[PDB]
Design a protein around this ligand. Structure first.
Ligand code: BGC
Ligand code: CA
Length: 305
């Protein structure tokens, strides 16, 4: 049986929970694969030790969701010594890191695209819901819940949601902006703070860089009897889709966990087998990278997900 080792940066990250469960199902369909999957508990030192163990166990490929993207070289050097291929996923290593090893690959997304799509989606719903412009000024007064500072998906979603609105002629006014570190509880706390501060009843739209944080904002709005304020996320988590259907979330953007898991598995299995990474598949690998598209989601198209 071919052993494939997988490290997940943090099991209880909502999005990576969807990804890891999907990878488990791809591996279950491969009768000759034993999956060795680890929770790194948000600590790169723990992950490094897990990789040593996976290599001791003779895995034929590694699929690595880094805690710290800067540790890509550390991981590569472990793998190099055993000639083991590494498919990094979701936390993007640098170009130089990928180019340092002939058997390093990456599966992820075009981070900018999700921000653009989210801004276009907000624009559509803004146009359709003129009552959302509480102060009648033609501008969106917003608050924004950011992911981890320096994470490329947080930075791009934060920049491009606003750029896209502004580029379409929709002026925006940032009433509050802070990180909630991708986390529901932190986002509920932060949103509750904003609902307790001087801008509370000026807020017209809540923009979150992911669904977990959007969900925390939804909870805080409910507690304040302000559920009429729309909230937008990114990921299209199953739980978030249920909230789109119920009207509690105004819209989101699919971060396609199923295809990211499938590509990661397929590439890792091919490489474990000594084949070309994309053999037998339709994955498009561009200079060692696969990027899976995002798709905007709201009630009108929900049943396609
Ligand atoms: O790296 C982890 C992060 O990846 C992003 O692409 C997701 O949208 C976030 O929900 C997740 O927290
Ligand atoms: Ca306004």
């Amino acid at each position: 049986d071919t052993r494939i080792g997988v490290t997940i940066y943090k099991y209880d990250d909502n999005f990576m929970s969807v990804v890891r469960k999907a990878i488990e199902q791809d591996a279950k369909a491969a009768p000759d694969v034993q999956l060795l999957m680890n929770d790194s508990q948000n600590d790169q030192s723990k992950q490094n030790d897990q990789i040593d163990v996976l290599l001791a166990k003779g895995v034929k490929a590694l699929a690595i969701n880094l805690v710290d993207p800067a540790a890509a070289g550390t991981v590569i050097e472990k793998a190099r010594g055993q000639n083991v291929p590494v498919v990094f996923f979701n936390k993007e290593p640098s170009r130089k890191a990928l180019d340092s090893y002939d058997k390093a690959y990456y599966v992820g997304t075009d981070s900018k695209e999700s921000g653009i799509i989210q801004g276009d989606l907000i624009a559509k719903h803004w146009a359709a819901n003129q009552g959302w412009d509480l102060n009648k000024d033609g501008q969106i007064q917003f608050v924004l819940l950011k992911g981890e500072p320096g994470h490329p998906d947080a930075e791009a979603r934060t920049t491009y949601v606003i750029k896209e609105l502004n580029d379409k002629g929709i002026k925006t006014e940032q009433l509050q902006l802070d990180t909630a570190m991708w986390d529901t509880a932190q986002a509920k706390d932060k949103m509750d703070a904003w609902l307790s501060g001087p801008n509370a009843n000026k807020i017209e739209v809540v923009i979150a860089n992911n669904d977990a944080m959007a969900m925390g904002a939804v909870e805080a709005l409910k507690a304040h009897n302000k559920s009429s304020i729309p909230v937008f996320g990114v990921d299209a988590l199953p739980e978030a889709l249920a909230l789109v259907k119920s009207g509690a979330l105004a819209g989101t953007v699919l971060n396609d966990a199923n295809n990211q898991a499938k590509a990661t598995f397929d590439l890792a299995k091919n490489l474990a087998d000594g084949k070309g990474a994309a053999d037998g598949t339709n994955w498009k690998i561009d200079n060692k990278v696969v990027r899976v598209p995002y798709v905007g989601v709201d009630k009108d198209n929900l049943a396609e997900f």
